[PDB]
């Protein structure tokens, strides 16, 4: 054929009033993405992925709104076949890229949290570029067969060319449509969950190690205070020196050196077979312990947590982009009693509101 006659079919009476929210959302998304890209023109990998996400999102949003606005206002409902194929390919490819970018952001957050000292040496401009190129190539390759398969084989009740909607004009295309969903979207869920469980599993042992060190130094010291033999004092002081060394390594800096020096001075006296002097030195060390042990451990608990609050903003994007997808999937498989115009409005909203929400969050 030459042209397709697009048509909200139920609400065909009033159409001007429906276009106000869509125009407002498009303007907001365009302005937000433009500002986000302009502000960078912060050289960190996470910001690079955020910029790529914003650019892909803006280009996706600009590829669907104008046709709907023109249909609503000017009532020009004719689309060339080439335009329909182009719009289909662009929409699907950009959704895939957005998912890939989210996955890359999750990986960057994981490598930041679990390895804070090797974050720069692992992520290099070359490796980041290779990852981005791989994501783009995977999305393009997986989205390339759709136009060819459709071209292998005149009213659309919609506002843009959707592959599932166009295919109704059967039992084979749906298999590939389901396979691609579980390769660029289904795998993203699994990888993000695995990258979040590993992050949350990390905070648990780093804090546990410091807690263990504090408990063992305190507990052991009580034993030294209640000490009765030349051997026991030495056996406890050696463990004290080891624990202090490890705790200072794990990192209020000098204070660890002072505690270590006090432990060393106590060890020498016990080496010379004096019990009272060792007990006195141990009691003296408790002063520096209370002076620096109390303050370091107080900040230690608050310290581990701050790194988990940098990952909080990235959870909102997932919640705002995946949950609408799940709602759309549920309404596209069990939504029979609802009239079709509700289906059209819901699909438009689920496709359009992530572009609105993303720039406002970041």
What whole-number distance in Å separates Cα of residue 174 and Cα of residue 166? 12
CA-CA-CA-CA torsion sign (145, 164, 185, 22): positive
Out of 1.20.120.10, 3.20.20.70, 2.60.40.10, 1.20.1440.230, select the CATH number for domain 204-306: 1.20.120.10
Return the exposure string of 83-94: e unless at least 16 CB atoms fall within 10 Å of the residue's CB, then b.
ebbebbbbbbbb
The two domains 3-184+311-361 and 204-306 share their CATH topology (first three levels equal): no
Length of the chain: 362
What whole-number distance in Å separates Cα of residue 276 and Cα of residue 222? 15
Q: Which long-range contacts (CB under 8 A, 24 or more apart) does 225-233 make?
A: 225/279, 225/282, 225/283, 227/275, 227/278, 227/279, 229/275, 230/270, 230/273, 230/275, 233/270, 233/275, 233/278, 233/279
Q: Are 160 and 88 in contact (CB under 8 A)?
A: no
Q: Which of 103, 6, 3, 58 lies closest to 358, judged by CA?
A: 58
CB atoms within 10 A of CB 239: 15
What whole-number distance in Å separates Cα of residue 243 and Cα of residue 38? 51
CA angle 59-319-187, nearest 5°?
Answer: 75
- The pair of structure tokens assigned to 31 is 């302005």
What whole-number distance in Å separates Cα of residue 307 and Cα of residue 205? 14
Return the exposure string of 35-70: e unless at least 16 CB atoms fall within 10 Å of the residue's CB, then b.
ebeeeeeeeebbebbbbbbbebbbebbebbbebbee
- Got the DSSP string for 149-171? HHHH--EESSSS--HHHHHT--T
Find how far residue 248's CA is from the centre of its chain. Answer: 32
Q: Residue 3 gets which letter from DSSP?
A: E
What whole-number distance in Å separates Cα of residue 335 and Cα of residue 330? 7
Instruction: Tell me which fold the domain 3-184+311-361 belongs to.
Output: Rhopdopsin 7-helix transmembrane proteins (1.20.1070)
Find how far residue 234's CA is from the centre of its chain. Answer: 51
What whole-number distance in Å separates Cα of residue 353 and Cα of residue 160? 16
Q: Are 100 and 62 in contact (CB under 8 A)?
A: no
- Burial degree of 320 (CB within 10 A; 0-12, 13-18, 19+): middle
- The pair of structure tokens assigned to 281 is 């030195």
Q: Which of 66, 82, 324 lies closest to 185, judged by CA?
A: 324
Q: Which of 39, 318, 26 lies closest to 196, judged by CA?
A: 318
Find how far residue 331's CA is from the centre of its chain. Answer: 26
What whole-number distance in Å separates Cα of residue 160 and Cα of residue 157? 9
- Residues with Cβ within 8 Å of residue 204, at least 6 apart in sequence: none
What whole-number distance in Å separates Cα of residue 261 and Cα of residue 71? 81
Using only C-alpha atoms, the chain has a radius of gyration, in whole angstroms, of 31
CA-CA-CA-CA torsion sign (41, 46, 48, 53): negative
Resolution to one decimal, Å: 3.7
- Structural domain boundaries in the chain: 3-184+311-361, 204-306
Alpha-carbon distance values, 350 to 320, 326, 344, 356, 362 (Å): 10, 10, 10, 11, 20
Q: Residue 80 gets which letter from DSSP?
A: E
- The pair of structure tokens assigned to 20 is 């106000």
CA angle 262-264-270, nearest 5°?
Answer: 105
Q: Give strand pairing partners of 3.
A: 80
Give the relative orientation of helices 145-152 and 125-143 as an angle to the nearest 10 degrees.
Answer: 10
């Amino acid at each position: 054929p030459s042209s397709f006659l697009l048509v909200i079919p139920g609400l065909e009476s009033v159409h001007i009033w429906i276009s106000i929210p869509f125009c407002a959302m498009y303007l907001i998304a365009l302005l937000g993405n433009s500002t986000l890209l302009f502000v960078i023109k912060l050289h960190e990998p996470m910001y690079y992925f955020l910029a790529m996400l914003a650019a892909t999102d803006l280009v996706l949003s600009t590829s669907t709104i104008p046709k709907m606005l023109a249909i609503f206002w000017f009532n020009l409902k004719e689309i060339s076949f080439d335009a329909c194929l182009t719009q289909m390919f662009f929409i699907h490819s950009f959704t895939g890229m957005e998912s890939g970018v989210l996955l890359a952001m999750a990986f960057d957050r994981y490598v930041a949290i679990c390895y804070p000292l090797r974050y720069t040496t692992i992520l290099t401009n070359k490796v980041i570029g290779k990852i981005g190129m791989a994501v783009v190539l995977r999305a393009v390759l997986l989205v390339i067969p759709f136009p060819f398969l459709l071209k292998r084989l005149n009213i659309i009740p919609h506002t843009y060319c959707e592959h599932m909607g166009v295919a109704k004009l059967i039992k084979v295309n749906i298999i590939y449509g389901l396979f691609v969903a579980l390769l660029i979207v289904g795998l993203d869920v699994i990888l993000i969950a695995l990258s979040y469980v590993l992050i949350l599993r990390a905070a648990r042992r780093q804090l546990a190690d410091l807690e263990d060190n504090w408990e063992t130094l305190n507990d052991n010291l009580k034993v030294i205070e209640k000490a009765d033999n030349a051997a026991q004092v030495k056996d406890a002081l050696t463990k004290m020196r080891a624990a202090a060394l490890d705790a200072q390594k794990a990192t209020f800096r000098h204070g660890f050196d002072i505690l270590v020096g006090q432990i060393d001075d106590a060890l020498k006296l016990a080496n010379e077979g004096k019990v009272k002097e060792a007990q006195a030195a141990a009691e003296q060390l408790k002063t520096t312990r209370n002076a620096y042990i109390q303050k370091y451990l107080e900040r230690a608990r608050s310290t581990l947590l701050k790194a988990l609050s940098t990952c909080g903003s990235h959870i909102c994007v997932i919640l705002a982009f995946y949950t609408p997808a799940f709602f759309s999937f549920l309404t596209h498989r069990f939504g029979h009693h609802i009239p079709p115009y509700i289906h059209i409005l819901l699909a438009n909203l689920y496709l359009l509101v992530p572009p609105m929400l993303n720039p406002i969050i970041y």
